[PDB]
């Protein structure tokens, strides 16, 4: 293939220079499991057992024994396939643009295929990270003009049937009020028998700034860590900041038994076989990627929104 197709060879030779997605820092290694799918959905069946009554004592003769029941629950996760197109220089024409310092046309913004693919893949990876964190697909700083997505395609911030707390705009700068809402949400958290797990908190930069203020010689960050340790069996609590959030606080456990990320094995950018060609020196290439695959247990994520108005 590499003898016949130059683009595949170039992609193979440059694929190692693409940085890893930053969403990996929001999950544990045990939480992520790939699936073989491009577009469609995946049914996940969870089996459970329950005790009908107290156990039966084995003494003398007895025929009536207590029973153990079984039950199943079906979860449907939707996956969607998306594509992008980009223009680049032709391999047979690169030699007419190979300057001593670089390759390409600065005047016309025309790049070699390898560099163009690397940059496009990085941009698409950033978009995928934004989707995984927020659950919406948009390219604007306002977050509007969102792409319409299928149902059962959720992110960490828009997952339904979770705990939602809202801080009024009057209390938008009161860390005591924000922490009161956080305490209420943590009390409403239901982690059951899986409560012994590390916890992850994601905050916006403004909340990160407010956290390092002295507690009304202790800090609000220390108070929050202690409060979360009070419920996670005093295990690790990790704090992360993301510029993709705005006045939002996300708290969730890093437990594979409660939250699982099952992305498609083709989620990250992949070249398409089709290459547009003509008589000029400009060619077009396509990059595919797949979105979807976050599964969460009900009432296991705390989402705090600090209203600005």
């Amino acid at each position: 293939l590499f003898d016949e197709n130059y683009y595949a060879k170039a992609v193979a030779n440059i694929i190692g220079e693409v940085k890893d997605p930053i969403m990996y820092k929001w999950f544990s290694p045990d939480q992520i499991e790939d699936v073989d799918l491009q577009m469609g959905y995946q049914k996940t069946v969870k089996w459970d057992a329950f005790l009908n009554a107290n156990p039966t004592t084995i003494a003398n003769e007895v025929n009536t024994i207590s029973t153990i029941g079984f039950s199943s629950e079906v979860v449907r996760l939707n996956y969607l396939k998306l594509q992008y197109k980009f223009r680049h220089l032709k391999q047979t024409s690169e030699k007419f643009y190979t300057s001593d310092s670089y390759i390409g046309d600065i005047n016309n913004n025309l790049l070699p295929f390898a560099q163009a693919y690397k940059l496009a893949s990085s941009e698409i990876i950033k978009l995928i990270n934004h989707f995984v964190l927020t659950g919406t697909v948009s390219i604007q700083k306002d977050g509007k003009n969102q792409k319409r997505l299928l149902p059962n395609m959720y992110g960490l911030l828009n997952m339904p049937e979770q705990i939602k707390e809202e801080v009024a705009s009057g209390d938008k700068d009161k860390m005591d009020k924000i922490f009161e809402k956080i305490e209420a949400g943590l009390s409403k958290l239901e982690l059951g028998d899986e409560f012994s797990t590390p916890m992850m908190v994601i905050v916006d930069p403004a909340t990160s700034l407010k956290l390092v203020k002295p507690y009304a010689c202790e800090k609000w960050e220390d108070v929050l860590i202690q409060t979360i340790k009070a419920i996670n069996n005093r295990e690790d609590v990790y704090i992360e900041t993301s510029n993709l959030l705005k006045h939002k606080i996300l708290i969730y456990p890093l437990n594979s038994e409660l939250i699982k990320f099952k992305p498609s094995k083709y989620m990250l950018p992949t070249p398409n076989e089709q290459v547009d060609k003509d008589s000029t020196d400009v060619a077009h290439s396509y990059i595919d990627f797949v979105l979807g695959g976050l599964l969460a247990t009900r009432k296991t994520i705390l989402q705090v929104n600090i209203k600005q108005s």
Partner: protein, 175 residues
């Protein structure tokens, strides 16, 4: 078309609510991560305490007699007899399970002792307490008190607005 979809969804939801184990899917996982009070579900078929010497029969089902006292219903004679929800002098047994693909109801005869969760009439569910005597009404639902020995071993459990289950021990026939 959206309104027709909405009506379709409401009616399919009602029919699912009138079922033991509907094919219903959701984006999330149900929060069942504790080992206590997990048997209070409508899909809990069979009995809580079952013997290996119990006589079990299967019959064609008329309607949905799941978790209800059943009676023999006969047709014009072209087709075989079947079982439908009922009680009183017509009581023949207790339906403990249904196979929906074949439409077959699993019945334990009244001559055999039974212990399990059964449907309770939605009138005195709050007044039903352990030890109270129960009888089967004309719809196969248990009610507080004749010819049937049935004792409640627990209180009512509200599975749905109009669905209440009670743990009951059905002995057999009374004087």
């Amino acid at each position: 078309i959206t309104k027709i979809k909405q009506e379709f969804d409401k009616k399919v939801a009602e029919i699912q609510a009138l079922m033991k184990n509907p094919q219903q899917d959701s984006g999330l996982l149900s929060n069942s991560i504790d080992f206590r009070d997990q048997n209070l579900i409508f899909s809990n078929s069979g009995g809580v305490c079952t013997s290996s010497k119990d006589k079990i029969e299967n019959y064609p089902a008329k309607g949905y007699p799941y978790k209800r006292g059943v009676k023999l219903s006969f047709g014009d004679g072209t087709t075989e007899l079947e079982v439908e929800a009922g009680g009183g002098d017509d009581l023949y047994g207790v339906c403990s399970d249904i196979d929906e693909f074949s439409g077959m109801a699993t019945v334990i005869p009244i001559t055999n002792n039974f212990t399990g969760y059964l449907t309770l009439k939605k009138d005195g569910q709050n007044g039903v307490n352990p030890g109270d005597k129960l009888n089967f009404n004309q719809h196969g639902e248990l009610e507080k008190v004749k010819s049937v020995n049935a004792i409640a071993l627990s209180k009512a459990h509200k599975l749905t607005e109009d669905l209440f289950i009670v743990l009951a021990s059905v002995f057999g026939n009374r004087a």
